[PDB]
Structure 1
Amino acid sequence: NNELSPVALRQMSCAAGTTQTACTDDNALAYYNTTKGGRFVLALLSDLQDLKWARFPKSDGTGTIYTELEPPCRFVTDTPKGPKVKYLYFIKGLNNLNRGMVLGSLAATVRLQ
């Protein structure tokens, strides 16, 4: 038994763009984690189709980082809504264990296709 993060995590909210300051209001289901030292997001989901940038606000507000994203992946979801498509992203430099954590939680707690 070597499980991949039994106790899960909580939350997904805020914004995104494609060229630095292109993040206007909210274009991301920026997913998970409020660590013990502070809010540190892990996963990003996008009902849109192409984004390279985002801006998550936290604590001071003045400190809100223009995150560099990575080339996306695509999948369809088994929501009660029906046909729903996003394009998956992770914050760049995210190590393998964190991606495994968020993928396992997303797949095992909520239904996808």
Structure 2
Amino acid sequence: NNELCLRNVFTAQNTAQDFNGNESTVKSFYVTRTGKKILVAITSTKDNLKTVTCLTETGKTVLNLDPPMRFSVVYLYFIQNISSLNRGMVIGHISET
């Protein structure tokens, strides 16, 4: 017997930084699981983001981004080394909306 843990995807916003250190607001995609959240991906019209801010209880954490993927034009970035399961959750969410 093993109970399925249903997870949710929630979008919000965060600050991201490009290679020149300039900040901008991005749409952020979180996977949540009863109390716990993980920042999985962001979207932006900017193709030059390098990092993104995630706010925790500990304070701010700065996360590296994987290269922008294309989908006036909006880019999707996954957070580096995020699990494939969490990636799948977010891809489905973006597609099913």
> Aligning the two structures, in what range does the TM-score lie when normalised by the shorter sequence?
0.7 to 0.9
1:31 aligns with 2:29: yes
Q: Distance in 2 between matches of 1:16 and 1:27?
A: 6
Paired AA for residue 66 in structure 1: V
In 1, the alpha carbon distance for the partners of 2:81 and 2:91 equals 16
Q: Secondary structure at the match of 1:34?
A: strand
Residue 93 of structure 1 aligns to a residue whose secondary structure is coil
**Two-structure CA RMSD over aligned residues (Å):** 2.5
Q: Shift of the alpha carbon at 1:50?
A: 1.1
Q: Which has the higher strand share?
A: 2
What is the number of equivalent residue pairs in this alignment? Answer: 93
In structure 2, the residue matched to 1:79 is none
Structure-2 change in CA distance of 1:7 and 1:30 (3 Å): closer
Structure 1: gaps spanning 5 or more residues: 1-5, 76-83
Identity of aligned residues (%): 29
Counterpart check, 1:71 vs 2:67 = yes
Q: List, as ranges, runs of 4+ consecutive aligned residues in structure 1 with deviation greater than 6 Å.
A: none
With structure 2 as the length reference, what TM-score do the two structures score? 0.76
TM-score between the two structures when normalised by the length of structure 1: 0.67
Q: For structure 2, which runs of at least 5 residues remain unmatched after alignment? A: 1-5
